[PDB]
Design a protein around this ligand. Sequence first.
Ligand SMILES: CCOCn1c(SC2CCCCC2)c(C(C)C)c(=O)[nH]c1=O
Lengths: 537, 416
Amino acid sequence: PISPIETVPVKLKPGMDGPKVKQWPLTEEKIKALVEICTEMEKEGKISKIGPENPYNTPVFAIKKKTKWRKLVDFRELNKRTQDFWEVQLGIPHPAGLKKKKSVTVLDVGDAYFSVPLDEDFRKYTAFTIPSINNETPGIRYQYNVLPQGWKGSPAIFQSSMTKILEPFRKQNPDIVIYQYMDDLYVGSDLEIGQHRTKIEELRQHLLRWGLTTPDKKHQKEPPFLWMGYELHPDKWTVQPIVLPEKDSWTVNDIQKLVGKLNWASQIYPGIKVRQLCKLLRGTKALTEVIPLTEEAELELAENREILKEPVHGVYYDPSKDLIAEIQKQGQGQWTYQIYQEPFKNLKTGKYARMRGAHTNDVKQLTEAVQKITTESIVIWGKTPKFKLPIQKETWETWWTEYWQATWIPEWEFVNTPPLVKLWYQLEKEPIVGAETFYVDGAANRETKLGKAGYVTNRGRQKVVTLTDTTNQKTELQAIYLALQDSGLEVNIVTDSQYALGIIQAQPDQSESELVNQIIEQLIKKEKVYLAWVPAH
Amino acid sequence: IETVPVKLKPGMDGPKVKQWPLTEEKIKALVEICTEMEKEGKISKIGPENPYNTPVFAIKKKDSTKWRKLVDFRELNKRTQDFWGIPHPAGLKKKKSVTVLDVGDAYFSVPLDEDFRKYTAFTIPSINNETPGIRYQYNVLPQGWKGSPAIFQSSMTKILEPFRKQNPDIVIYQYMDDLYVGSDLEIGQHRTKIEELRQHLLRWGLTYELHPDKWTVQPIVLPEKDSWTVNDIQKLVGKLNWASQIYPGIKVRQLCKLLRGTKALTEVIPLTEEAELELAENREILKEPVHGVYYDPSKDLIAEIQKQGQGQWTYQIYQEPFKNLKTGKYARMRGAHTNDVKQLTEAVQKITTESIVIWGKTPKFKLPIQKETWETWWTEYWQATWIPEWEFVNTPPLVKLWYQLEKEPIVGAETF
Ligand SMILES: CCOCn1c(SC2CCCCC2)c(C(C)C)c(=O)[nH]c1=O
């Protein structure tokens, strides 16, 4: 059960050398075990008894499972002195992108790691030693002939080998999809179950051909398949049940795990909340610190248990059908979406953590949500979804058409499902005839942080205020704030504030400054505003 | 023939760039194209012991639906030893008209040194990662690699010479996978000659209408009004002010005088004879580009773009701040009316080609777009074998305001 498979040319890193760390000592009880285990592999062909010619070595240990003694070789060192390979698939498939299959059979190619050969030129760096009863005469020397478990190259190499082998079958059976993942091969089809079964057996046999020994009936996996928090059934997918333990004492860790698992849930279940629980982490002094849950928290944690009792289910990808994506602004910065082909039958749902920045607007954020989604779709369905967005086209056209930055939204359609996104305000194109005119200004000693800010209008109104512990931007921005307060529904404000210039261009509706936020609230409350920038001094 | 040994710059290792996500139809094409190349032996599958990797993608060839493979060796090119190619024909940019030819197929029949091949590794993605990437590697000279056109210089001058010599008046300049040809001949006379040469290139196995003569660098045109308002002056003064970073003889002095006090933003102000002249001097200064600006090969080329909205975009090609080598405007192409990205990328290429045409090197772009927005969609509208470097930036408000003044034609180029 070894293999007549080509080996891959493996080299070490840039001029380094095979590991040479001494063998951790063991008891007679642990030695006997390894010798046992080793003697079997020695014959199974996995390893070969060597000699002193090998200057390299690696630590082998003994750990029993749930009570037979199993062995463990520590390759950390080698792995360090091992060249690099091309990442062995770090991007795994998402259920929302699988097609439903009349059948899906899973073949186990477990020990396969120990079934494929190693680069005959490399096998020396894998050499390890089975000690003798407490540092007596030297022990038994071995070295791996097959891909060693826990070794850097093993995952990459295994998957490559398994690919060459599946090349033919796949080329010969187009109507069949196989998914290579570690020790598994999920093979699915739409052939009649008898046909399916027959083919499977054909595959198994072809494998048996290359020494990839056949599994057992006991170890056979069956639907529903558990995958990244999901339960994959033949006709649909569901969520692996998620339970919030009931406790009388909650530590910081417990509140963080809870928040952790809860957050991941906000992605599939609608209504999840963690705000009140998240307050529980303020001033926490130690992971094990016991934090008493507030009424708001106990209530929150309560509703959640109930939401999680919901049987959210989903559907699989049907290439014949449209890909629709509908988004909702669940709040400033927060967004939700659901990719579906036919109404109410979702492929995938999702939410995006309150995107908080230095200064943007909803439309801009809307756009970002859209792109993250499009990138997501491209990977999952190799195509972009038609978008149903809660924003009129006039709003979009108005925004995008003049915004200083390049932006875009693929084909999309409007859907009146409040709340809709809109432009809270629009600085006037030209100064306002009739409206008052404020000539604002703010000054502060960058060092004494003592400053003042005010304005003078073409109409006589004038104010000034002293501010302690302030910066120049603030004063200026404050200059603008008052102007906005002390003014009517139509104002003309002029300033030599460099920031007010960025505001004129971006016209944000949210930012890192409560102060700027204040200005915005006022900006929004206004009927007509004309911001003007003029050089300072 | 034989393979000339190529090597990376001392200390550089092969590129290991991730493969960005590809659309289904795009992956389909590359799989065809690639199995074809495999058969034809230009490339052959590779193992995991090859850790390098360059991104690949698919574009559309003009007039046809047939897809074209495009690999982004920007990273590999960068780390590739230098072969110090052809100097720049200062006369190219002068010719009345220029045409570009896609001669990247030429290299396909030239072996690549075996030791370098690893560095050309590239992967073909798969929807939802349901299939491991299809890893290949080049055997022949790859399209898009700087090393290619280089190694194929002798073999090119050779096949070109009998035409260059035959037609000493026409200019032929080669860049990356492209060939830039430009004659002064009449349109008819020009195009046919191209075909003539074409058949010539056709004689071995190989198959845009530019006009550098009109690539004038436009001037800044200041406003002009019957009566002027506080605002109008306030605006103007800020622009001139900023602009004095270029033309120092520019003055706002007097204008700032009649701007003292606190009156309605809309109130009309009388222009003092001093402000009048100050403004007139300013117009005279802006009548031409700033003196003393010369291209310096030892320095990178920079191209910045500002979005003027409504489909209009301004750009500046410079190497030193305010010391532009060229400036300009760009209006979108009939069929990009709802796609910002498209216009931007359509422009990048135009500007790059011009850069090539004029200096024989692509400039470094400063794009007024968000990383994610660009990286997600430019490949959708890319149509050149080469790819220019770029960075994403935030357009300073004023910079936009200034160049927004770029002098525009009376009616423009009249195509009767
Ligand atoms: C029993 C259903 O198994 C889920 N499933 C599946 S199996 C699924 C199992 C978890 C890892 C990803 C693949 C497949 C293929 C890959 C066999 C498919 O095409 N379509 C599916 O619906």
